[PDB]
Amino acid sequence: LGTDDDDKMKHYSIQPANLEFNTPVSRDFDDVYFSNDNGLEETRYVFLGGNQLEVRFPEHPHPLFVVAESGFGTGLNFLTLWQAFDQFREAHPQAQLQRLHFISFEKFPLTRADLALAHQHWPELAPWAEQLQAQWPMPLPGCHRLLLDAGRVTLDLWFGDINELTSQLDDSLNQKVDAWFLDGFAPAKNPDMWTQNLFNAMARLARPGGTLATFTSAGFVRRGLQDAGFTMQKRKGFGRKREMLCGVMEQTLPLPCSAPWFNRTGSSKREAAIIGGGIASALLSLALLRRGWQVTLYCADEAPALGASGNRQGALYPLLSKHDEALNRFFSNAFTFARRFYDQLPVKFDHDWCGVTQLGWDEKSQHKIAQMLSMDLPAELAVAVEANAVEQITGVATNCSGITYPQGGWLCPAELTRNVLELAQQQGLQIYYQYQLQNFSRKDDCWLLNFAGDQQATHSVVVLANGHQISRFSQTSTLPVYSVAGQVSHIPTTPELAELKQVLCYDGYLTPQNPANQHHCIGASYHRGSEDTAYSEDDQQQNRQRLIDCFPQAQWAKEVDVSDKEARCGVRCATRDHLPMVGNVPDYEATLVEYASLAEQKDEAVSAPVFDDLFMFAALGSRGLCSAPLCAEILAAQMSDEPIPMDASTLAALNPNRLWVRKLLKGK
Ligand SMILES: Cc1cc2nc3c(=O)[nH]c(=O)nc-3n(C[C@H](O)[C@H](O)[C@H](O)COP(=O)(O)OP(=O)(O)OC[C@H]3O[C@@H](n4cnc5c(N)ncnc54)[C@H](O)[C@@H]3O)c2cc1C
Ligand SMILES: C[S@@+](CC[C@H](N)C(=O)[O-])C[C@H]1O[C@@H](n2cnc3c(N)ncnc32)[C@H](O)[C@@H]1O
Ligand SMILES: [Cl-]
């Protein structure tokens, strides 16, 4: 034992569908995706009509409707639903139902090319089809979220085998699905996907009273779903087909609580105070406002992005890893989500998706790159680059190989934070600057916040998104986060340095010029356990010098000029395991008492001891531009008892009580 023999069976890319036309036909399955002339009206009859969506929409007593689907395929069901939802909202703008959520699972996703071709056969759907195509995700495993129409429609595509994926979903998703679209290839010649495990999962995820519909009337499917707990009914088939099936969950099933120590719970309340001013608090605000939360932001400073989020140019690429499975999945999916989110964001901020190139300057660095190169990632995520091609790619001669992230680049985090915050204010965010939270206590049924002035406010929900100062409250004092101060030097461009087309990562990082500035940013110093933001001359020199040590023959590297003493200093908040800390704020003392002997009383274990209606968005390290968007989704979903776009184990890797609970589990 102890060998890497497993690695040859692991895959970090999902493979696309083998498509042909005549209508899209699957080569692998020898079936059509849908029927030829009548595909659109059949879709409306089977999936919309069989779940009685038109009747239910105007009386639906929740602001969200959640449809879940087996087998996304062409997207026809999704597009047809969206169209119907849009028509519903126009006819009944006063209805409580304001937002659509669609969760689909897909083993063989279409390429962007095939998807665009499939959609050509339905010019009626083109306004919706085009928006889908604009965000169609890179085929990586697991959950991919697309905010469509500014969050009015949300699409979670889970890439992989549906029968592997269903047991990977978080508990939060149970009893949340209003309607099932049980699609797939005709049972009698894809029996493989129509399993009991599938039907049971559908039953688990179904809201009590929730529906399902399907095209087939195969006996074994009817009985399988009855055994899962749905009340099933035969209804007339569209066209030639004599019969289809629909069902209702007419009972309340026992709610699952495996791993209660990782329970992500939400809140019933809809007004929140956020303690922040940085990227995290900014993106969170958007995510909460689009759901009709009342949001108040408090910031200690005179203006926002004076914390760690205040640089002029930060790099955006994912931290990949061969050994940390959860770190790799998080950053890969956060990264591509971050790119879609930033593309869609109606806010001006200086950026350029010019690519990021990491360089093998060292034996130690070549080896970390080689580790990453030995995973089969899609080229669109990360791809090797020879030494000869590096100069063509980056613009500069580095004299060594590397790996490039072609969808990566730089953005201006200070401006992004300010302009997002300014958008949130137009959407209703109340900001109070020069409000430094000292304290908060539970009074009656509110959180009482005490600011440094004898100022007080009361709020229903409090979210701590205050960077390195996260652990300065008694209810947070024992979080395993630590401060890392650092300095990024601002440098003028030269003729040699104006040739840089990309962000270079080495023992440090160098951005290309911001053409509006004629300046690059180059960093960064790393001071573990320091909260000191004073300008350091040694750090400044060292930001130049590290670059020169990595590429000793590079005449462009010597043209870096730090003599202006221009720099920016901030304090990162990090964890040993490099993942964020996002979720309920855990009660340390109550965790330790309640899970004292957890190593042998797992079965009787209570829900994770947390503070009520108190959340945190924290520890973004030096990769917050990459991680904040998806973390904003996760937290705001969790807070709202809405579908979280991540698998259970990656969520557990992001839970704030994780260190304590890991030790307590193993008895230590
Ligand atoms: C040197 C350096 C280089 C970096 N390089 C990169 C990079 O290349 N790529 C990248 O993606 N990221 C980079 N980062 C940033 C990293 O992503 C940070 O972790 C990120 O900016 C964290 O943002 P935040 O919103 O969590 O916290 P912050 O930006 O630190 O914001 C904290 C906010 O909380 C407020 N606050 C604190 N205490 C209180 C209080 N008690 N009451 C009210 N308000 C309070 C502060 O006013 C502040 O506005 C870098 C950061 C540094 C310092
Ligand atoms: C009939 S198509 C789906 C319908 C789609 N909305 C359309 O109109 O084109 C069937 C889909 O099921 C998918 N599928 C088959 N087995 C699967 C599995 N085990 N997990 C996830 N998807 C699967 C296929 O990839 C295919 O995309
Ligand atoms: Cl930055």
Author numbering: -7 to 14, 18 to 663
Please quote the authors directly:
Methylaminomethyl modification of uridine or 2-thiouridine (mnm5U34 or mnm5s2U34) at the wobble position of tRNAs specific for glutamate, lysine and arginine are observed in Escherichia coli and allow for specific recognition of codons ending in A or G. In the biosynthetic pathway responsible for this post-transcriptional modification, the bifunctional enzyme MnmC catalyzes the conversion of its hypermodified substrate carboxymethylaminomethyl uridine (cmnm5U34) to mnm5U34. MnmC (formally known as YfcK or TrmC) is a bifunctional enzyme responsible for the final two steps of biosynthetic pathway of mnm5s2U in tRNAGlu and tRNALys, and mnm5U in tRNAArg. The C-terminal domain (MnmC1) catalyzes the flavin adenine dinucleotide (FAD)-dependent oxidation of the Cα-N bond in cmnm5U34. The resulting imine intermediate is (presumably) non-enzymatically hydrolyzed to 5-aminomethyl uridine (nm5U34), followed by S-adenosyl L-methionine (SAM)-dependent methylation to yield mnm5U in the N-terminal domain active site (MnmC2).
Here we present the FAD/SAM-bound crystal structures of full-length MnmC from E. coli (ecMnmC) and Y. pestis (ypMnmC), and an FAD-bound crystal structure of ypMnmC. In the ecMnmC structure, out of 668 residues, only residues 15–17 and 664–668 could not be modeled. Our structures show that ecMnmC and ypMnmC bind SAM in an almost identical manner. Most interactions between SAM and the protein occur through van der Waals contacts and hydrogen bonds with backbone carbonyl groups, including Phe-67, Thr-69, and Ile-157 in the ecMnmC structure. The next closest polar side chain belongs to Asp-26 in ecMnmC, which is 6.6 Å away. Each domain contributes about 40 residues to the interdomain interface, which buries 1578 Å2 of accessible surface area in ecMnmC.
